[PDB]
Amino acid sequence: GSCQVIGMYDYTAQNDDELAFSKGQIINVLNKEDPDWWKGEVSGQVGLFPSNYVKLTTDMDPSQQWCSDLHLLDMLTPTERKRQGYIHELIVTEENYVNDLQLVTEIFQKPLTESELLTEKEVAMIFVNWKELIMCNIKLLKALRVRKKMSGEKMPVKMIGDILSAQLPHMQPYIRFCSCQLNGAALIQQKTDEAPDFKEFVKRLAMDPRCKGMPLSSFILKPMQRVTRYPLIIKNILENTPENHPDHSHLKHALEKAEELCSQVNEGVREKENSDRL
C-alpha cells in the first residue's frame, strides 16, 4: 500500500537499482515486499531503499508536527498527545484555509470584478458564493481562536467538539459552491482561450508571491478539499477521546454532521453533473 516515509538519515545509493535520499526527505513508498528494501519514488525516480533508514509518517507523533511547542506536552499520555496534535492540525489548517480563501478574493476576485474583462455573471460563474464561504469559516476560525485563548497561550485544549458540532450546520453554502465549481472551471478555461486580454491579466494576478505559483484553477478547488478533509481530522480527534471524556459526545455528533455535509456536497456535485446531460 502506497504511503510516505521520511528519511531519518542520509543514504547514498550503493547499487544502480537504489534510491539515494537525504535526512528529512519524504519518499513515496510503492511497495514493502522485501521487509528490508522498500520500493520508493522521489521526484518521479524509482528505486529500492533500506527500510531501516526511514520512518513512516503515520508513525510520527501528530503533536510533534502541529504543536511541538505546546506546554506540558511531554507530560501528557501518548493518547492525549495525539488528541492535541489532531486538534491543532484542525486549527492550524483552518487558519491556513481561511487565509487562502481571503487571499483568492483579494488577488483574484476583486481584481477581476474591476477588470471588466468579463461580465458580472462571468464573475459569479467562477467565484459563485465564494464570499459566503469566507463568512461561515471565519466564524468557525474565530470560535476556535477563542477556545485557544480560553485554554491558555500554548496550553492543551480540553474541548473542541462543541464548537465543531455547533459550527458545522452553517456550512450549507458549500453544497452550492462545490456543485458549481465544475462549470466555473470550464468558464475560466473558455475565457483564457477566447479572450487574450484574459489569459494575460489572470497570469499577472497569479504571480503575487503569496500564490506560491498556484493558478486560480487550483485555488478554486480548495473548498471541496476542505469539506472532505474535516471528517478525517475529526475522526482522529474522536479516536483519542475516551467515552468518559466531556468532549467525546460532541465529537461523535460533529463527526456525523461533517460526514453528511461531505455527502450532501458530493450528492450536489453528482446531481448537477448529471443534469448537464438533460
Residue numbers in the entry: -1 to 0, 1151 to 1426
Paper text:
We were unable to crystallize the SH3(E)-DH-PH fragment, but the SH3(E)-DH fragment (1151–1431) yielded well-formed, hexagonal-shaped crystals, belonging to space group P3221 with two chains in the asymmetric unit. The SH3(E) domain in one of the two protein chains is disordered and thus was not modeled. The linker connecting the SH3(E) domain and DH domain (1204–1225) is well ordered in both chains of the asymmetric unit, with residues 1210–1214 unexpectedly forming a short α-helix. The DH domain (1226–1431) is an elongated helical bundle structurally homologous to other DH domains of known structure. The GEF activity of intersectin-1L is controlled by a core autoinhibitory interaction involving the fifth SH3 domain (SH3(E)) and the catalytic DH domain The crystal structure of the SH3(E)-DH domain fragment presented here reveals a homodimer in a domain swapped arrangement with the SH3 from one monomer forming an intermolecular interaction with the DH domain of the other monomer. The SH3(E) domain from one monomer forms an intermolecular interaction with the C-terminal half of the DH domain from the second monomer. This interaction occurs side of the DH-domain opposite the Cdc42 GTPase binding site. It buries 534 Å2 of surface area on the DH domain, and involves contacts with the first half of α2, the middle fragment of α3, and one face of the c-terminal region of α6 (with the other face of α6 interacting with the DH domain from the other chain). The structure of the “repressed” DH domain as reported in this study is highly similar to the “active” DH domain observed in the crystal structure of human intersectin-1L complexed with Cdc42. However, both analytical ultracentrifugation and gel filtration analysis indicate the nucleotide exchange repressed SH3(E)-DH fragment is exclusively monomeric at micromolar concentrations, more than 100 times greater than used in the in vitro nucleotide exchange activity assay.
